[PDB]
Amino acid sequence: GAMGASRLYTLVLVLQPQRVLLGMKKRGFGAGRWGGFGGKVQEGETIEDGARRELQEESGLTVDALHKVGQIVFEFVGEPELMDVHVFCTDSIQGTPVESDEMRPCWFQLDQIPFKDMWPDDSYWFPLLLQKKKFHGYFKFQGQDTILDYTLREVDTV
Template sequence: MSAPIALTASLPRPAVKAKAHKLYNLILPISLSTGLVLLGYKKRGFGIGKYNGFGGKVEAGETLAGSAARELHEESGIVCSEEQLAHHAVLLLETVAEGKEAEMEMVKEKVLEIHVFVCTQWEGEVEETDEMRPQWFAPEDLPLDDMWEETRIWMLTALGMYLSVPASAAAATANSSSCGAGPGAFNPPPPTTTMTTTHPDRKWFIHYVDFHGGVNAQTGEWDPWHGMGKSVWKWFDTPLVDWSREEVVAWVEGVRNGGEGKAEQVEA
């Protein structure tokens, strides 16, 4: 287990109300031999019309890696063991969009905590499912305008740990449209998006984003998970998968209370 996490940012008072976390996983199958990543085109439900990695909710009684392996198989047909899944990131997403509808209020009560895995070895053949249509992409050819706003930032960073990411790909990310609001400045920019080689010494990061609402280009309708606002990024030197639930919640609450999400390991 990692050492306890202490927030170094001074938090203002009164603090905002803490939110519960809803656990998800997201998996990126990467072919090292071809330099391609497998993404899925969402055919139905939440995120319809967008490309992303494979994944879904962590069900009761499942481990993070176990749920990731299950979702990957269900959505793409390929089989990857828990041991073949490398955990690299935690995405912490919330919407602060205004809305009085009961459904909107329920959406605003939770932080989406999405654990990102990469697999480079698997068995079976890629196949289309009822929910997802898989497609291989080079980092420079990602379908940026058909992806979630925050994904356009973090995905190239994750790919840069395994593949060569041309500078042109980073430029395309910066210039992509954003389905409701411009990507804007994020602090700090993910280092690997400007790299032209792999970045093996950077392995774990957290990306926090809040959304203020905007038009979803794929549906043409207003959506609370568009209009990216505050964006906080931090690299870590130890595996995030070892963090306790309390540590993850403390980190994001530090950000939500006006801090920069800075955390450091302290001696027990």
């Protein structure tokens, strides 16, 4: 049948030449895991403006520009609505990261990416982001730990 309907999300990775900024989610879905900054796109809001807003809300940072790097669709067994996640990166940040209600930030050196405490899917697509390759992916999860199916492809244009 038809693909499930999806909710539009953004995900932002602050990626500098030697380090990446990650936030530990403090509560709720995905609590305890390190990852990028993001959330739901709002009505009338462009995707990139939503990405800027979520980054500012969750880390306090503003950015000059955001670069589109990928798109990932997430499906969770038992929930028919998908997450349609537009992934961005930036390397020019203004301000300092601050702990928010949602996220506790730390910088990680790029030879210390904490995959064991990140979402399982990050092990597959984060290496492509680091190579400056654009990608489309899909991950079907049972709960928060188990991947039942995934697809991933490098693309020329996100």
